[PDB]
């Protein structure tokens, strides 16, 4: 199971220490598009401000055991697929993705990332939960706002 770094911090706690009103702080979201009807707009938005880490993985609703905090209906995604991890990096809040040695891989902006390695996320970045785009019905967009 995933063990958080010593400098893990939630965006809420970080931004609160800095004494920031809504308009003066950065907030974080995972925007989920269901590809087949993305013209209708985002299917869901997951708030990423309250925890220092979020486990992404399979949750179909098709009995199913769910471990992930962010459950995506991807048939070929793993139950524990990847983690979104916030870190207070020498005083600067940064966010990383790490693939948890998933079966099919995690793609960041169409690049399969190396397994078990934090890779920095930037606003607008697109995650998909397989190295095979053909198999992905969803795309997950990391947003800073
Ligand atoms: Cl590599
Ligand atoms: Mg959930």
Q: What is the CATH number of the domain that holds 137?
A: 2.60.200.20
User: Residue 27 C-alpha to ligand 1 middle, in angstroms?
Assistant: 30
* Angle subtended at Cα 109 by Cα 38 and Cα 67, rounded to the nearest 5 degrees: 75
3-state secondary structure of 88: strand
Q: Contact 48/28 with Cβ under 8 angstroms?
A: yes
User: Residue 130 C-alpha to ligand 1 middle, in angstroms?
Assistant: 17
Cα 71 to Cα 18, 22, 59, 108, 134: the distances in Å are 31, 28, 5, 18, 20
* Residue 55 in tokens: 């486990």
User: Residue 39 C-alpha to ligand 1 middle, in angstroms?
Assistant: 35
Report resolution (Å) to 1 decimal. 1.8
User: Residue 109 C-alpha to ligand 1 middle, in angstroms?
Assistant: 16
Helix, strand, coil proportions of the chain in percent (round to 5)? 15, 35, 50
User: Residue 114 C-alpha to ligand 1 middle, in angstroms?
Assistant: 5
Enclosing domain of residue 78: 1-145
Q: Name the DSSP class of 41.
A: -
Q: Contact 91/13 with Cβ under 8 angstroms?
A: no
User: Residue 100 C-alpha to ligand 1 middle, in angstroms?
Assistant: 15
Q: Contact 54/70 with Cβ under 8 angstroms?
A: yes
Q: Which ligand is nearest to the CA of 111?
A: 1
Angstrom distance (rounded) from CA 102 to CA 128: 12
* Angle subtended at Cα 56 by Cα 50 and Cα 58, rounded to the nearest 5 degrees: 140
Q: Which ligand is nearest to the CA of 115?
A: 1
Number of domains in the chain: 1
b (16+ CB within 10 A) / e for 31-57: bbbbeeeeeeeebeebebbebbbbbbb
């Amino acid at each position: 199971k995933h063990v958080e770094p010593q400098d893990a911090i939630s965006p809420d706690n970080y931004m609160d220490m800095l004494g920031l009103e809504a308009r003066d702080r950065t907030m974080y979201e995972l925007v989920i598009y269901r590809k087949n009807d993305k013209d209708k707009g985002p299917w869901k938005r997951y708030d990423l401000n309250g925890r220092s880490c979020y486990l992404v993985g399979r949750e179909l609703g098709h009995t199913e055991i769910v471990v992930a905090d962010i459950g995506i209906p991807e048939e070929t995604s793993s139950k524990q697929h990847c983690v979104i991890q916030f870190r207070n990096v020498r005083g600067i809040l940064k966010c990383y993705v790490m693939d948890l040695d998933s079966s099919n891989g995690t793609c960041l902006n169409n690049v399969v990332i190396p397994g078990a390695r934090y890779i920095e996320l930037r606003s607008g970045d697109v995650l998909t939960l397989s190295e095979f785009e053909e198999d992905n019905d969803y795309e997950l967009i990391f947003m800073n706002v």
